[PDB]
Write a protein that binds this ligand. Structure first.
Ligand SMILES: Nc1nc2c(ncn2[C@@H]2O[C@H](COP(=O)(O)OP(=O)(O)O)[C@@H](O)[C@H]2O)c(=O)[nH]1
Ligand SMILES: Nc1nc2c(ncn2[C@@H]2O[C@H](COP(=O)(O)OP(=O)(O)O)[C@@H](O)[C@H]2O)c(=O)[nH]1
Ligand SMILES: [Mg+2]
Ligand SMILES: [Mg+2]
Ligand SMILES: [Mg+2]
Ligand SMILES: [Mg+2]
Lengths: 320, 320
């Protein structure tokens, strides 16, 4: 079995194909604590051991430690989160080959050439042995690594003439990464990674507006408000009974304005692109400003409506 | 201004393009009551008059009256719902030209030829004069009518050879309609409309499982549960604090099995199609069973991840 894994530091996205020809997409969050969970009843908990440390999936992990999520790519917790995503995907426990991801500035050095040291480091990370209490864990065999961004734009890149170029804008949970690649993948023109802002900027604003606990527990409510920010009818029913709808709508717009200004400022660093694509979980939050501020015809502007999965699907289309 | 309007009896979907080139999509429900709403405070309410009757947008309209929604297409309420959709879209009040829809079996007679009488009736419905209390209403000038289903598959159909044919499966709020069209729109091979089941079957099952009020108010909670039915993490936080996650999950699965069995039974009435497309708000609910049970390669199976808008987007691509 071959599983494509975009192991982001906010959510692990999986994609694979079964025997009946159905193509499956699964998402599991990066939310673990460094201790086992205690269950006195029949609640299922997931308690792991890796490198001699205990970890467990935590549904209310604190939104804390909003720092270096680059180190996370080579961490013990990353190994746990990937195993946890596999364990909760619905696939049967088996040996699996996988293809994982490295952020553009980790996969590539400043010369836009493969950073072999990081690529190997990433593969080695998955050899760390893991155990699950009360169950069998999948076994990771072959590990291939793809860079983020490019796989998402590959289908389009194949169609572009070599002198044309696609600008791929990825807004993730904690970072905003942009790359410009020549048609038919004939070269990387520029990569600009930015780890100062992500969708969590908006999520944090929402949780502050509604004074929600700063944990994973309230992440769902916050995302729903954001996703349905333009539907008063939905907001009317969801918002914690009251009508702080005004104050939340306000906080959202402010964070969104920040994201939009950042992308437009960084966009000015790029030139000569002929096509534009916006991906990642936060794509819908910045697509309008980007389209408005680029001189690119509709026909050459790409955004799907399943953006958080654009990368892993591109990876699957390439390697499956 | 030209607005594309898929005026379905569950939701009105709008699509248009302004000046900056941004393409806008808006959704507004069909939920009105036959009397004005009273507001003693500053809560905005929309009170209309049309054909000599008062109607008002009602956020908690009873889910009742699951009988004939076909007549709704030529009703006074349909005129109000469309004006209400326009009033809440963000567009400025003005004269507008529009293109609306008629269900396949209303647009076409049993010989699969245009039912001019229904087409004219639809156009005339919009000449009914409407008034809003406390504000101005849009003025509808030119009215064009497109049939449902075909516009959604038009992009693909243009690419098909004349001997090939696309099967378009549309699961809406209260109906499931299927059509088979020859490549390059070279003829309609078959239309099978079914008014006995829709997405509301699953919604109703969910409301009964959580004992929610049978009104529009709980529609949002019900749809979220369905949409996130495969995410225990999200369900854990959303379900009315309890743990009927088993019992609601149970009810959904049975309603979904009923929808899947119906589509598959109706599919056996069609043959010779080479490509399949699944659309409508309920597309994600039956796509797997349909893919599983057709002998059509991945490359010839079409499903977007914005299914409730496939038809109006197709309409817009044709006439904008
Ligand atoms: N507003 C919005 N947020 C989304 C959408 N899809 C996913 N997200 C969220 O956007 C954030 C970014 O997730 P993702 O890009 O997958 O990134 P990662 O783990 O850094 O790769 C997450 O918190 C997601 O839950 C969407 O359609 N709209
Ligand atoms: N499960 C699910 N329901 C959806 C989705 N998009 C829309 N819906 C719902 O599906 C139902 C059908 O809506 P729609 O097809 O637009 O039909 P209509 O007004 O009869 O045309 C509505 O209750 C929508 O809220 C989706 O992605 N998933
Ligand atoms: Mg990512
Ligand atoms: Mg990764
Ligand atoms: Mg419809
Ligand atoms: Mg209609």
């Amino acid at each position: 079995m071959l599983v494509f894994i975009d192991d982001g530091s906010t959510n692990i996205k999986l994609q694979w194909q079964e025997s009946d020809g159905t193509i499956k997409q699964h998402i599991s969050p990066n939310s673990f604590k460094r201790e086992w969970a205690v269950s006195f009843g029949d609640k299922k908990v997931f308690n792991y051991t890796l490198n001699g440390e205990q970890y467990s999936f935590d549904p209310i992990s604190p939104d804390a430690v909003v720092t270096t999520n680059i180190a996370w790519q080579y961490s013990d917790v990353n190994v746990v989160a990937v195993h946890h995503a596999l364990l909760t995907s619905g696939l049967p426990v088996s040996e699996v080959d996988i293809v994982c991801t490295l952020p553009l500035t980790e996969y590539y050095d400043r010369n836009n050439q493969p950073n072999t040291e990081n690529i190997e480091r990433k593969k080695a990370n998955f050899r760390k042995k893991i155990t699950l209490n009360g169950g069998d864990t999948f076994t990771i065999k072959d590990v291939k690594v793809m860079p983020e961004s490019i796989p998402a734009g590959y289908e389009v890149l194949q169609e572009l003439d070599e002198l044309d170029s696609l600008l791929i804008i990825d807004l993730g949970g904690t970072t905003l990464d942009i790359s410009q690649v020549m048609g038919k993948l004939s070269g990387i023109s520029k990569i600009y990674g930015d780890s100062s802002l992500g969708v969590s900027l908006v999520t944090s604003a929402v949780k502050d507006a509604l004074s929600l606990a700063r944990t994973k527990g309230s992440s769902y409510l916050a995302d729903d408000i954001i996703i349905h920010r333009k539907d008063n009818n939905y907001l009317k029913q969801r918002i914690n009974d009251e009508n702080k709808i005004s104050i939340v709508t306000e906080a959202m717009n402010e964070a969104l304005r920040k994201l939009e200004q950042r992308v437009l400022n960084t966009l000015n660093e790029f030139s000569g692109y002929t096509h534009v694509m916006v991906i990642g979980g936060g794509a819908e939050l910045i697509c309008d400003a980007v389209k408005k501020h680029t001189q690119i015809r509709d026909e050459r502007f790409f955004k799907t409506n399943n953006s958080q999965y654009d990368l892993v699907n591109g990876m699957y289309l390439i390697g499956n």
